[PDB]
């Protein structure tokens, strides 16, 4: 199987001897600007620049020029954002905790905030969601220690179902 990821709307990474051609819009097809190669030299993937607009057409061809994979979507269709840069936690007088983070440089992301008792398991994460750039987690005990982590998750209605969430913050 082949995989495509658009990292933070900056680059597009295609991973699968195969050759890749690409174009934005209806211009001339162009070769992959930077293949990933094995020790013998068989291609393992490709990185190319991401454009915020225009349709990215992908054509992956086997040794023989036979089509093995084709695609045509906006680059953002495969969006994987960078994680939020640095998370802040502020106890409110309400007894709630306000979680905040810096905004991404583009719209259409939800943020998933997870928390758990610091003693708890990796299967004890509680999740809440909301838009940029902060949200509130209630009902927490002020004397216990909690772990928090965040990732950005592209909205399905905004970017489609082929987009994916960032890695979790530390």
């Amino acid at each position: 199987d082949v995989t495509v990821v658009c990292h933070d709307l900056e680059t597009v990474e295609v991973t699968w001897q195969l050759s890749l051609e690409f174009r934005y819009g209806t211009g001339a097809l162009q070769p992959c600007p930077r293949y990933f190669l094995s020790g013998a030299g068989v291609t393992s993937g490709c990185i190319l620049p991401a454009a915020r607009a225009g349709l990215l057409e992908l054509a992956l061809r086997d040794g023989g020029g036979a089509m093995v994979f084709k695609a045509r979507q906006r680059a953002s269709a495969w969006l994987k954002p960078r994680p939020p840069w640095n998370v802040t936690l502020l106890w409110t007088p309400d007894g709630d905790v306000t979680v905040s983070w810096p905004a991404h440089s583009y719209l259409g992301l939800d943020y998933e905030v997870q928390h758990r008792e610091s003693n708890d398991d990796e299967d004890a994460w509680q999740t809440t969601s909301g838009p940029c750039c902060d949200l509130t987690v209630g009902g927490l005990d002020p004397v216990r220690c909690y772990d928090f982590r965040v990732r950005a998750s592209p909205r399905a209605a905004h970017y489609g179902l082929e987009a994916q969430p960032s890695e979790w913050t530390a």
Binding site: G54, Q73, R74, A77, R155, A157, H158, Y159
Partner: protein, 108 residues
């Protein structure tokens, strides 16, 4: 018509919470390469309206689909002065959905 006077905030909320689910529901995972794109919200709405509400050969019922009826109503309600092969239906539906994505990503 010029969709530039539309209340895009209201329309966005309608799409995200209703029309989007209708489109994906009809497509059931089926997908196609897109054909046309758009670079502004008004321009995207223009393509969306045309693709969504004008019937085409092989899918005469497209404008009668649930996602389509809601779209017509959303424009009427939120824009000033606004007036069979299943595979074909899906193809057009896929195009329309992708135009919505462009709409969401485009500037006002």
């Amino acid at each position: 018509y010029n969709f530039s006077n539309c209340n895009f905030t209201s329309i966005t909320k309608i799409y995200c919470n209703i029309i989007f689910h209708d489109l994906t529901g009809d497509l059931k995972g089926a997908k196609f390469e897109q054909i046309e794109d758009c670079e502004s919200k008004p321009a995207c709405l223009l393509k969306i309206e045309y693709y969504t509400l004008n019937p085409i050969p092989g899918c005469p019922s497209l404008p009668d689909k649930t996602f389509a009826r809601r779209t017509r109503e959303a424009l009427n309600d939120h824009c000033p002065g606004y007036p069979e092969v299943q595979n074909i239906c899906l193809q057009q539906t896929s195009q329309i959905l992708r135009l919505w994505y462009s709409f969401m990503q485009s500037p006002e």
